[PDB]
Design an enzyme around this catalytic site. Structure first.
Site, PDB file in Angstrom:
ATOM      1  N   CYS A  96       0.818  -1.226   0.000  1.00 20.34           N
ATOM      2  CA  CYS A  96       0.000   0.000   0.000  1.00 20.34           C
ATOM      3  C   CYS A  96       0.853   1.278   0.000  1.00 20.34           C
ATOM      4  CB  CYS A  96      -1.087  -0.104   1.079  1.00 20.34           C
ATOM      5  SG  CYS A  96      -2.241   1.289   0.963  1.00 20.34           S
ATOM      6  N   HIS A 152      -3.279  -5.080  -0.001  1.00 16.84           N
ATOM      7  CA  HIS A 152      -2.758  -5.722   1.199  1.00 16.84           C
ATOM      8  C   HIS A 152      -2.730  -7.233   0.993  1.00 16.84           C
ATOM      9  CE1 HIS A 152      -2.571  -2.328   4.043  1.00 16.84           C
ATOM     10  NE2 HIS A 152      -3.419  -1.761   3.171  1.00 16.84           N
ATOM     11  N   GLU A 195      -1.663  -9.445   3.013  1.00 16.57           N
ATOM     12  CA  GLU A 195      -1.790 -10.066   4.330  1.00 16.57           C
ATOM     13  C   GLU A 195      -3.109 -10.786   4.533  1.00 16.57           C
ATOM     14  OE1 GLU A 195      -1.345  -5.722   5.414  1.00 16.57           O
ATOM     15  OE2 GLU A 195      -1.044  -6.791   3.518  1.00 16.57           O
TER      16      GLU A 195
END
Ligand SMILES: Nc1ncnc2c1ncn2[C@@H]1O[C@H](COP(=O)(O)OP(=O)(O)OP(=O)(O)O)[C@@H](O)[C@H]1O
Ligand SMILES: O=c1ccn([C@@H]2O[C@H](COP(=O)(O)OP(=O)(O)OP(=O)(O)O)[C@@H](O)[C@H]2O)c(=O)[nH]1
Ligand SMILES: O=c1ccn([C@@H]2O[C@H](COP(=O)(O)OP(=O)(O)OP(=O)(O)O)[C@@H](O)[C@H]2O)c(=O)[nH]1
Ligand SMILES: O=c1ccn([C@@H]2O[C@H](COP(=O)(O)OP(=O)(O)OP(=O)(O)O)[C@@H](O)[C@H]2O)c(=O)[nH]1
Ligand SMILES: [Mg+2]
Ligand SMILES: [Mg+2]
Ligand SMILES: [Mg+2]
Ligand SMILES: [Mg+2]
Lengths: 559, 372, 186
Positions: free
Chosen positions: A404, A525, A527
């Site tokens: 990001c 993202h 994650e």
């Protein structure tokens, strides 16, 4: 539908999310489809307004739901996808009944917290626990409810009253309650009176627990277990000893050693749910994959060090999904992860005027790092520090991932130091100052799951290779800015290729810099899409680049 | 790494439910309380920040008064209980700060002391250290007056017995490792006869070797049983509480129905030579607390006294034997009373001060200071 | 951090002065010899590199035969002394390697043994450990056949006497601390 409620205790932050996630993972090893609901007694509609300084990181769903950190724990442990409706909050449920009243759907009765709000809660839990959360369109077999906060708090009162009624509106043997509790150890003695006072609150509120999970700094003594099993009307086989362990990947194998599947299978009649032999192979295939990754966690020895460069690195929960995603990458490489936590502001030279201890420990860590992550933070105050960390990685050949804000500080670095426009900047930091070389520009959050498509001249890149060379990448977004398209062909003329974009081509989403071993940036993202047995590809690529064997990993990915 | 307030909040709800309000919250913790934790407790309970006292885990309890003095708890209670309106003289107000400065002295002398003394406490169940709480405090008060750091070596008397080397060699050697390491020995006045054959070794060791000894209650008795078996030479002589119906002839214990509470003990006349009469200021009577059912047999007394084991003190009737000292040994004293119960923080019990002084050297310098 | 050769060079000059030449140099050192140090000794003395044996400080002397076997010293002496030309049977040549394998056995059983046994040796002058050299070796041989690591506890018998507690309390208690610790007494 079966329900397991994981609940309450002596303290907040006791371990309910760990035991709820372990219980769901364990039940899945019988072939059962498992879903989850988090109840949070807080009033916020969703986490998207509230800062990472309370309850850790905001988690982002495919819906674009900005939700509780606990929903991320269920997604990664169970292999499931959740909607914004899977997080119940006091705000959502009071809002639901108030909106329904002003429209007249209670037909001119007085709307009371009991029954009406406690019926909205039971209507919601039944609506939502039937939602499909797997890769297949089956409704679930089990719902886990994590009841947030502590039992006996005013904010919990409507939710425990709804669960008291739900225990009967649904049959017995379709409902079980696990209560998590604290056993203090004081002068070498394990103390039972805090857990006894917590069983009195459940009785007062009209609930009985089927398991007591006892959290302790030691293994429970069998005399302590006997005592808990005297005061609570439960057998010794119904107190599970959940001591402090260094790793949470071990907690499922603790509860498997303690017969908790075997108990719940007889308490919830789980052998009477219809399943195929295909479902019963898939269950033990997940179990043996868990025993593999936990064995490979214990006998691994060779370390890899990753610098996580950000703000507020003292609140390690502000990066919980980043942390788990570095762990999953580490476990697939079979190397022990050390995260080096680096505050980006301390990397700035002015820190050496403020406190020399903080300046040198930051650069001591950043020099020590086998790889660097810029994690995708919040609020622009640390950027001039992260620009140094991105410069260091590019000048030195050290493996890098930018998430990001980590696209943006890297492009800002590359603009200032390789194109040579030394003031070029993040518009979010300067706005009204109106510099000409704007690196960030606004194109109102771009939220949730989106498609990213690879630009054609890009199969050379490590990042397209790590994604299996599939034409599209689908990943979760939570950004307001873009890289400026006017600066793209300037950057591409200098080797900083924007390897992936939105289908419209206006929006820049993946890069790789030519020639460097691994210098990758994503505007999504990665994650939130990481799973315990399938790490997120950009993080697996960073930990592999940091370890060597990036080529052997790319080879295994290409089969 | 987070200090949790919800257990203390649930405890304030129980007090309100039961109709009580607390004036102080004393918070017990493994850390100093964070000031944000104090603020939170002072929000949920309707009390100021100055009314939560932080009572963290400290290595020594003699420090806890000076913690609460640092935390204004007298100053609060003086305004909460109107204690300045109780009538007192200036004599009463000198005595108060004279006790305070004596507390600051003994706590300073606890922190800057360095030289160790090791005492073996020889007993049963030495793993439950609270089973000897008054003994322990009485060794501490003696240590603090000698200005030497106490280590109690906790010795299970049954593990001293040779049969333990057949049962578990680790327990046998650790017990004798401790008993050899000891600068002094206490037999503490235990309960139930099951360990006596082990304590007889510990009493033999101290007498054969010149190591300082104190025997309390049962510690008279195992020492007299040792002295009978090993210096008079009647090798079966015994505690009647252990054998009763077996009817051996050399009974060392005999019954004379608990002899309980404070009694007078009077020194036999030929006894000012003894360290134990000297430690008591050479005052004619000793008044101390009793909890015993047996005595030493008076028929064996003049036999023992012919061999140097003088019964230095007795009950006013003379039938009952209460203090000994053995001739020639540096310190081999026994009391049938419990000297623990009469120990004060600023005035240690004389038999324990005599043992810790004998173990340290400077027994003579202590006796000199006592004699003023 | 530098290994010094001039003391060994001055010792080769004394041998030449006295009319002797050495066939081996055995070098005793607190480290393994560096190969540059070996080369230097082999320049000043007129001998090859294969004729300086590195005999560093080792914790056990039962290992020293297997050091010199690793360093070709039999193989050198067999060509320097024509030892293959001494008449021997195959019976003599089985007995030789049967002793070698028995040495490799007891030295392996010395290195992988772990469980301790403590023996008090009670005597005078226990600070001069060479005053008991045969006693010490005989406790070691017993220990090696039991496969337990020997610790000798050296106990001065005079310090066990009570009068030592008047003279020096440190010596009295360390002696009885050792004697109580002992699994056996000599
Ligand atoms: N068995 C355990 N051993 C060690 N640490 C544990 C264990 N269970 C939980 N933890 C840790 O405790 C912390 C908080 O646990 P968890 O997030 O499950 O709390 P909670 O009570 O559900 O509430 P909250 O969401 O407010 O934290 C985490 O760091 C977690 O890893
Ligand atoms: O200071 C004390 C402590 C305890 N007691 C009395 O002894 C009992 C001992 O009970 P505690 O409250 O000491 O312990 P418990 O058995 O409830 O269990 P844990 O908290 O240790 O897990 C108490 O219930 C009370 O009746 C006292 O009279 N005084
Ligand atoms: O898992 C959780 C924890 C907490 N909460 C919500 O956030 C609040 C945080 O409160 P906690 O119960 O986490 O802590 P506290 O402020 O009461 O104090 P300590 O126990 O830490 O001393 C709770 O009261 C509840 O409303 C959740 O919704 N879920
Ligand atoms: O202080 C010094 C040392 C050495 N030298 C000169 O340099 C030479 C270095 O020789 P040294 O005597 O320093 O060493 P070396 O090579 O004989 O071997 P080791 O003792 O280190 O094993 C000496 O022989 C002398 O000629 C000096 O002029 N001054
Ligand atoms: Mg809190
Ligand atoms: Mg949780
Ligand atoms: Mg108790
Ligand atoms: Mg030289």
């Amino acid at each position: 539908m079966k329900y397991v409620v994981v609940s309450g205790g002596v303290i907040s932050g006791i371990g309910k999310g760990v035991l709820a996630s372990s219980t769901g993972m364990l039940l899945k090893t019988l072939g059962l489809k498992v879903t989850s609901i988090k109840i949070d007694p807080y009033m916020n509609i969703d986490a998207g307004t509230m800062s990472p300084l309370e309850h850790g990181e905001c988690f982002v769903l495919d819906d674009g739901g900005e939700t509780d950190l606990d929903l991320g724990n269920y997604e990664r442990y169970l292999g499931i996808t959740l909607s914004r409706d899977h997080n119940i909050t006091t705000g959502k449920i009071y809002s639901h009944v108030i909106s329904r009243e002003r429209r007249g759907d209670y037909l001119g009765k007085t709307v009371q917290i009991v029954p009406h709000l406690t019926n909205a809660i039971q209507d919601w839990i039944q609506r939502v626990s039937k939602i499909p959360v797997d890769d297949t369109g089956l409704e679930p077999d089990v719902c886990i409810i994590e009841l947030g906060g502590t039992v006996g708090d005013i904010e919990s009162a409507p939710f425990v009253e709804a669960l008291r009624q739900f225990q009967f509106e649904v049959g017995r043997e379709n409902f079980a309650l696990i209560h998590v509790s604290l056993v203090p150890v004081i002068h070498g003695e394990q103390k039972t009176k805090p857990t006894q006072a917590a069983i009195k609150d459940l009785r007062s509120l009209g609930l009985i627990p089927d398991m007591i999970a006892c959290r302790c700094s030691e293994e429970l003594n069998r005399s302590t277990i006997d005592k808990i099993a005297m005061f609570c009307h439960v057998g010794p086989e119904q107190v599970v000893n959940v001591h402090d362990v260094n790793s949470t990947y071990h907690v499922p194998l603790l509860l498997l050693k303690q017969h908790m599947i075997d108990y719940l299978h007889s308490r919830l009649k789980l052998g009477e749910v219809p399943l195929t032999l295909e479902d019963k192979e898939r269950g033990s295939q997940l179990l043996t994959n868990w025993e593999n990754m936990t064995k490979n966690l214990d006998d691994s020895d060779d370390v890899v060090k990753i610098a996580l460069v950000g703000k507020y690195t003292n609140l390690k929960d502000s990066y919980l999904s980043v942390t788990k995603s570095l762990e999953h990458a580490s476990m697939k490489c079979r190397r022990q992860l050390e995260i080096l936590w680096v505050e980006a502001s301390n990397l700035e030279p002015e820190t050496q005027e403020v406190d020399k201890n903080k300046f040198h420990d930051s650069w001591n860590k950043l020099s020590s790092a086998d790889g660097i992550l810029v994690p995708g933070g919040f609020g622009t105050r640390g950027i001039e520090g992260m620009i140094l960390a991105a410069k260091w990685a590019r000048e030195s050949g050290v493996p890098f991932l930018g998430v990001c804000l980590g696209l943006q500080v890297a492009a800002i670095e590359f603009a200032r130091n390789v194109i040579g426009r030394p003031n070029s900047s993040s518009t979010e930091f300067l706005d009204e100052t109106l510099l000409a070389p704007e690196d960030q520009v606004v194109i109102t959050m771009r939220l949730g799951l989106r498609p990213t498509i690879f630009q054609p001249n890009s199969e050379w890149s490590n990042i397209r290779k790590l994604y299996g060379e599939v034409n599209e990448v689908h990943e979760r977004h939570r950004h307001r800015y873009e890289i400026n398209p006017k600066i793209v062909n300037d950057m591409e003329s200098r080797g900083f290729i924007f390897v992936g974009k939105d289908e419209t081509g206006q929006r820049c989403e993946i890069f790789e810099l030519k020639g460097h071993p691994y210098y990758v940036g994503t505007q999504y993202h990665p994650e939130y899409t990481s799973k315990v047995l399938e790490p997120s590809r950009p993080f697996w690529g960073l930990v592999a680049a940091a370890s060597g064997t990036l080529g052997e990993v790319i080879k295994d990915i290409n089969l």
